[PDB]
C-alpha cells in the first residue's frame, strides 16, 4: 500500500491519474482524460486502508472526481471503488459509478456503472 | 415463494408487472410501463429459488425485459436482481441494470443502475 500506490497510473482508454497516498490514509491527485492538457485535468480526493492485512490480500481504496475545472463543467461526479494489488505487475481493479445532476423526473437515468483497471505501464 | 410471488405488483412510479411463478423455478409475465395500453407491454422471463430457506430469509429471484414489442424498439434490455419478502406487507426489493446497444466507442455509457421496490398494493 502507500509507497506502492503513490505514482502515475494509466487505464486501457488512455486516461492518467496521478496520486499521493498519505500516511494517514488520504489519497490526493489529479485525473487527466487525456495525457497532456490542463483543460482535461480534474482534482481527485479519496481514502485507502493504511494498515492492510499481511496475508496476500489487496488494499481497499476509493476516490471521487467532480467534473468541474476552470474550463468546463459537466454537472456530474464519478466515484471509483476497488483494491490495489502489488507486485511485479501492480494494478488497481475498480468498479465505478458516474452520477449526473438531473431533474426529479429524470432521476432514473442519473447513474452509470462500469469498471476500470489501472496499471503503472502505459501500453 | 411461488404462490406468494404469482400476481400483480406495482412500483413507486406506476409500472405494473404481472408474473406466474412455475413449480420448477420459472417466472413468466409482462411488464407494463403504464397501467393500460398494449404498446407499453413487454415480455419478461426469469428464475427464482423454488425451495427457499425455512428461517426468515427472502426468496432470491431475477428477470429480464428486452424493450422491443410490436410497436416500439428501444434497443436495450433491463435485468432486475433481488428478493421476495412475504407476509402481510409483501414486497420485492430489487436492484436493476439497463444496458443499451452502443457502438464500441460509446460502450462506457452503455449501462445504467438503479433500484426498485414492488408492492401488491397500488397507492
Amino acid at each position: 500500500a502507500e509507497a506502492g500506490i503513490t505514482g502515475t497510473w494509466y487505464n486501457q482508454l488512455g486516461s492518467t491519474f496521478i496520486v499521493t497516498a498519505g500516511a494517514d490514509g488520504a489519497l490526493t491527485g489529479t485525473y487527466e482524460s487525456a495525457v497532456g492538457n490542463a483543460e482535461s485535468r480534474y482534482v481527485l480526493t479519496g481514502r485507502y486502508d493504511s494498515a492492510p492485512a499481511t496475508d496476500g490480500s489487496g488494499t481497499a481504496l476509493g476516490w471521487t472526481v467532480a467534473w468541474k475545472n476552470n474550463y468546463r463543467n459537466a454537472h456530474s461526479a464519478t466515484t471509483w471503488s476497488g483494491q490495489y494489488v502489488g507486485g511485479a505487475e501492480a494494478r488497481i481493479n475498480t468498479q465505478w459509478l458516474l452520477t449526473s445532476g438531473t431533474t426529479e423526473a429524470n432521476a432514473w437515468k442519473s447513474t452509470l456503472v462500469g469498471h476500470d483497471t489501472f496499471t503503472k505501464v502505459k501500453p | 415463494a411461488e404462490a406468494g410471488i404469482t400476481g400483480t405488483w406495482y412500483n413507486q412510479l406506476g409500472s405494473t408487472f404481472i408474473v406466474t411463478a412455475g413449480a420448477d423455478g420459472a417466472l413468466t409475465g409482462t411488464y407494463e410501463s403504464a397501467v393500460g395500453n398494449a404498446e407499453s407491454r413487454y415480455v419478461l422471463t426469469g428464475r427464482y429459488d423454488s425451495a427457499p430457506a425455512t428461517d426468515g430469509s427472502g426468496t432470491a429471484l431475477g428477470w429480464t425485459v428486452a424493450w422491443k414489442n410490436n410497436y416500439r424498439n428501444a434497443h436495450s434490455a433491463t435485468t432486475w436482481s433481488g428478493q421476495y419478502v412475504g407476509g402481510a406487507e409483501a414486497r420485492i426489493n430489487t436492484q436493476w441494470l439497463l444496458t443499451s446497444g452502443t457502438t464500441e466507442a460509446n460502450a462506457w455509457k452503455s449501462t445504467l443502475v438503479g433500484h426498485d421496490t414492488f408492492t401488491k398494493v397500488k397507492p
Binding site: 482508454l13 482524460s33 482535461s40 480534474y42 467534473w67 456530474s76 458516474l98 | 462506457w108 455509457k109
Partner: peptide, 6 residues
C-alpha cells in the same frame, strides 16, 4: 463525449 472519456 463526457470528460471521463475524452
Amino acid at each position: 463525449c463526457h470528460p471521463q472519456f475524452c
